[PDB]
Ligand SMILES: CCc1c(-c2csc(N3CCNC[C@@H]3C(=O)NCCc3ccno3)n2)[nH]c(C)c1C(C)=O
């Protein structure tokens with residue numbers, strides 16, 4: 828319960844972050860050639876929000892696993908100097924820095 832309220836705060840803060848715009852919704856593979864082929868386990872903030880809403884996270888470590896997946900997928904598919912890659916580095920650094928000043 829302490830673990831979960833922290834996840835609510837971090838997710839709320841990532842959802843409203845300026846650099847969150849690539850990660851608010853699932854990537855549409857119909858619009859992104861090669862995405863289905865390369866990214867085996869898609870993840871985004873709204874899927875995390877839904878899982879948290881239905882109580883599908885048992886511990887904060889599962890939440891952090893999903894967050895890290897978002898940024899791992901991002902760095903796998905996008906160039907570091909791409910518009911999406913640049914936002915993903917800002918969001919990843921934000922998440923890591925928020926996570927550790929809680930744990
Ligand atoms: C690069 C695609 C991507 C996004 C993402 C979400 S909105 C968005 N933008 C919309 C405005 N114009 C620039 C860019 C874009 O090209 N949208 C069309 C493709 C699309 C939209 C939604 N789904 O596909 N980009 N987020 C991640 C993690 C991505 C990848 C490839 O990893």
Ligand SMILES: [Mg+2]
Nearest residue numbers: 895896898899
């Ligand atoms: Mg990692």
